[model samples]
Target: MRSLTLQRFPATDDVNPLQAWEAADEYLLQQLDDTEIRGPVLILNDAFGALSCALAEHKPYSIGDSYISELATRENLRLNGIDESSVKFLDSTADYPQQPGVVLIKVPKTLALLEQQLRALRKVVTSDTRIIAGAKARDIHTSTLELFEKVLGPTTTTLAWKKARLINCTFNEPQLADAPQTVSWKLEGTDWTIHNHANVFSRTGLDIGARFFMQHLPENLEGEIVDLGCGNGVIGLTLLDKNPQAKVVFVDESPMAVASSRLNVETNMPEALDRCEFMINNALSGVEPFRFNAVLCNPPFDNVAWEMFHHARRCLKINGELYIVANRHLDYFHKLKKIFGNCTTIATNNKFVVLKAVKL
Candidate 1:
């Protein structure tokens, strides 16, 4: 068979139906199959593991920043009856290319992620190395091309096909690629430093929604608590300071977020290090039900709200509490009420609202 079946992460994203792979993925696969590739194939940002599963014959080394992407790759590989060991998945935060002969990149959504990956390429790419990248035609801008040229060498593009295009970059003489890979800022009016990796949301400073949520965070909360989708571990860090008797579980789907949260806690609250738990995961999946006393959340870009509420309600003990902040006037209220059987507006501004629910 020339094709493989794939599913988006969670494989149950009924909220917004989308395919796992795009035309760009097909184009790259076609081109690679036709051309002779020299070295170990490395795939970067293979959304939903489509590229990895398709290229499993090469035993490709794939790297991504999202836990969901890695999870999807495993699931898709199984869905197609491919051996799970056929490919290797690497964490972008901790892994680097090991003498890759051919490099295939999916052209990540974030410029910083691409810049960092390209800079990493400087260490291993040779003049004969085959480097290719693909994305939606509209996503390929002058600035995007500039990154390839500036970091690696001469870069050119092929005519758009199926509204997608492939970029061919030649590795000529290497140039110095330098940029700040991580962003750091102190929490407003506090001495705690927050470090954000490239893929973490809100790299520069506190987002207004999270800022408002911080003010209304239930004070004096004790016992086991979870900061779901914890970015930079800010809420968990604040919770630790407010509730001396409490320990926090920091969970996020982004490897960078989990790592950043750990770094923040280690840097700012060394004594609390033994009290924090960090996990790269989706919602509270795999967490023992009725274990946590409370969950504090600021949903990321937004997804699986119904599922998260469902999980949160199951994860918390009887009479436990759950808190979340979101833009005002969202239907989250009704879902929260339906799931938990109780929802109340604890705080609201013109643009944002903080809601609380009890696990009855």
Candidate 2:
């Protein structure tokens, strides 16, 4: 694997965390150098900071919907010896700042999320601002450009490099429209409903794994607990209803997921807000280990074309009990046993398994 030499950190770490930087990130940076664009750049969807950190030398401001991505970017910047103090970072819920001279964006995977960001951008950017969007070549579509023209400006794409393309957009002073909101799903047989915004998994209803996990959740679960890789905070929210006194930590990588979790928790169980901690975490990296009496997870095996697990292990505390539901074919029982001393099949259906592990 290739590595970026951080001016400050001594070791080579995967800055982007999602493996390689897409051709678009490289192409966009190449163009930035080619055009000799100067400081005061705004970068969006900087997954793991490949583009943002490379330009961190230029003191660019970064914005994105993933708290995990933001943390990773900062880690990478410090690793590379870039001065972190010079950059401003914003969350997805935060309003877009006044348009800078230039904007670079990595078109997010969720088109709806992209539309929301673009609509917000339309309100602040100027006609003279040079906006560049990047995506894998196959993702570039007529509608993609139309979205830009409709929301923010006129846009065109450059030749593909490394199977990715850079879309050049000029702000057109368009009127901003309202961004999309979370979609709601009625949970069967219960008054409970789930709110899932774009970028959340299984947005419409309970994921099969979660459904199974919910059914098999250990009886008498109490005290502090965590829902790892929580999508819309369904598992944790349900747990809170059952264990009224339990402090539930809901963690997911997507900002949308975190936001939805917060909304659902507040809407459904307002009193549990203090006990519920919503974290936009990639896994459990930021969570303290062995801190919970029980942990629930319907781990996302893949997202944005990457497989992840190591971080989950890091999140568990010694003697912690982990309850997991995953596709039966994933053979996660073995992996669980490797982490904890023992693993048990709590329940299994045709497609999925409810697994429990007790840390040794």
Candidate 3:
């Protein structure tokens, strides 16, 4: 087998964490060498380009829900001199475009997402299809194996190697007669109900940070408003009720999130459909500059939060307001002040804080 050099993009400065490729990836490749499943390949949840790039000769179709993952895969393929067209990319919300005789997956962080992906795969795989999945040993629990059995078919796992393991599932059952759909919940003191696709953040209910921001939303806001990193559109939907005339744009990197936001908006405020837009994009990457009069965000506390803050600053119009809610320990106020030149505490609870900033 030819060797490939791969690196995670937007490189982190953290002290030597796991590489983009891991032992589990190598173990899956070894299994493929021993098996004789000659059909179209479907790759899911590849953290970077590891599995896809290695299997580029098979012309695998890659599916995932993260913009960062997609970006990393594209760059790494180019870096390794592989033909970008050899691997096809699909967003999680997209319909399955092809039937796969063999499926490869890197188990995701969320079980809900894994279940949803398995359900979608169930619609296409046949008795002859073979499914192989890999993950860190710590992530594979008894319930994880049970989910694979319940959703796909009977499953077995290999002995752990380098703290990682691979699961093999036989695809011998008929397609699932009925698959579950998005979960829904309604917030108290409001007519609005939020819908959450499996991959969406805080799918179960209103997160505490979001609940805090809801209480301190600016009054009678007007002009173009953006729900930056809008997950399931709860914040934007609530804002719509407060200012019916304001045009709202919901943006997120996850396609499932964008879809959830759109569904919630259409269900609750059908009239606002014409006035609203949903985008699946990296933090305001393609958004029009200086167009939004106000931006609301509850940033995910990963390294990506810094980039999101920078993007929000660029998206806001002069003197535009930016509202943010974060854990009290995150200390985002300092970063917001650096970007906006001013930030004020709007509200705070024991665990969370809401901060407001104005673009100067």
Candidate 4:
């Protein structure tokens, strides 16, 4: 077997604690073992192109919700001297391209997303199709198999090796009812509704941090605005509702998030849709610098808060303001102070704090 090299995107100088590919990938490849699949092969949630690149000869269709994942896959394929066009890349929001004879999946972190993907498969695949799912031993549980059985068909697990396992499933007749599409909830004090696709953040309801930030939104805002890390786009939709003359840009790294934001804006604020731009981006990497008057964010704390803060600062025009909400215990206030030379607490409660800063 030829060796392939892969690296994580936005490459870091520090040694990576976690590997780009896991044991589950190797286990799946070993199981495939010279088998010839008749129809198109579908690869789901490939973290960094390990499965797709290795099976480049098979020309698998790779689908994922993460913009970063797709970006990394493209880079790795190019790095390995493989033609970027060898494997087809599709966003999760897109419909499955064709009926698949074999489907390979890397069980996602969230069970809701896994359920959604499996439900989608039911519509296209028939009784003769095979579904092979891979995951770490720790990630697999009774509920995991239960979900697979409910959505696809009868499923059984392989013996564990290298702390990883493969799930073999046989497709069954399609269920009579259609799978759930989007979740909807009415905003507390308003008639407006929010729509969330299956994989979007806070699909069940409003997140507490978002609720706090909405209450403290700056008044009389005007000029270009950005909703950084905009999930489902409640923040940007509310901003557009208040400031009719201002144009808003919604940016997120998840394709599902961008799709949900576009859907929500079109459904609730139809008139404002023309004034908005939805982008699947990585921390506004390709966005023009010093272009926005205000940026709103409920920043994530997954070790990337500092990087997001730096990107926010770069996107701001002179005297442009940045608004953020975070858990009270996180030291985002200190990071904001370092980036903007000042930070102010606009609102606070027991669990969350809303902070604001201005570009000097």
How does each model score on lDDT?
0.86, 0.75, 0.85, 0.85
TM-score attained by model 2: 0.86
| lDDT per residue (tens digit) for residues 1-360 in model 2 | 125642211123557434535678878877766576655688898877777777766678788777766776777777777777756788765677675778898888777777777876776788767789988889888888888888877677788887888888887777655655778988775687788877788887778777777788865666788887788888888888788777888887777888889989888779888888887665665556557777788876543211223444455566667888888897688877775657999889999988888766
**Winner of 1 and 3 under lDDT:** 1
List TM-score per model, in order: 0.95, 0.86, 0.94, 0.95
Say which candidate scores most in TM-score.
1
Count clashes in each candidate, considering only residues at least 3 apart in sequence or on different chains.
Answer: 0, 6, 0, 0
Off by over 4 Å in 2: 1-20, 34-39, 173-177, 302-319
Which one wins on lDDT? 1
Model 1 residue 90 lDDT?
82
Q: Give per-residue CA lDDT, model 4, range 203-275, as digits (tens).
A: 8899988988898998677788999989899999989988888899999988888888998888887989888
Give stretches of model 4 more than 4 Å off.
12-15, 174-176
Tell me model 1's lDDT, rounded to 2 decimals. Answer: 0.86
Q: Higher-TM-score candidate among 2 and 4?
A: 4
Off by over 4 Å in 1: 12-17
Q: List the residue pairs that clash in candidate 4.
A: none
Tens-digit lDDT track of model 3 for 125-220: 876787899988898888888888888899888999988899999875635567556999887788888889988999998888888898898767
Per-model root-mean-square deviation over C-alphas: 1.9, 3.8, 2.0, 1.8
By lDDT, the better pick of 1 and 4 is: 1
